[PDB]
Amino acid sequence: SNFLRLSDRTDPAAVYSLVTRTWGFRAPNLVVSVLGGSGGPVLQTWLQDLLRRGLVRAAQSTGAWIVTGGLHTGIGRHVGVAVRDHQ
């Protein structure tokens, strides 16, 4: 993966240019920012189906970026599980 420790007061232009040009990421056609996440390692089955069949599949078809927390907990963990199951 590509990681960068960056200050809180970092202008988005520099990091976006780093991602698109230096790290070789295509510019997104859509950005879905996933928020929230109820406590508990187990999500509702319909919610998991929505994350996998709905969000990740649409992101792959439209060439989108899925943006959330990168940590292995909460909604980040659930979106990662959806990505893994889709792949």
Add this chain to the structure above:
Amino acid sequence: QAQVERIMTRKELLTVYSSEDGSEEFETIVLKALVKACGYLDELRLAVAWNRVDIAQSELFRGDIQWRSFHLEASLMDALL
């Protein structure tokens, strides 16, 4: 009556093949009869012992359980051997 009481004493070893269950659901029922007896084996190691990759895929895809690293490593060693 005493014999039936002794039967029900170890009631975790008894499973019922309900009339609702179809024939195509035989193996799954066997699974739910074996792992319940365990509580060593898990559904992944049983799926590897048999040649049923569909059962392994179904078990891995279900989200209610969270398979840990020692389940997966045991199943992978069984599959490699």
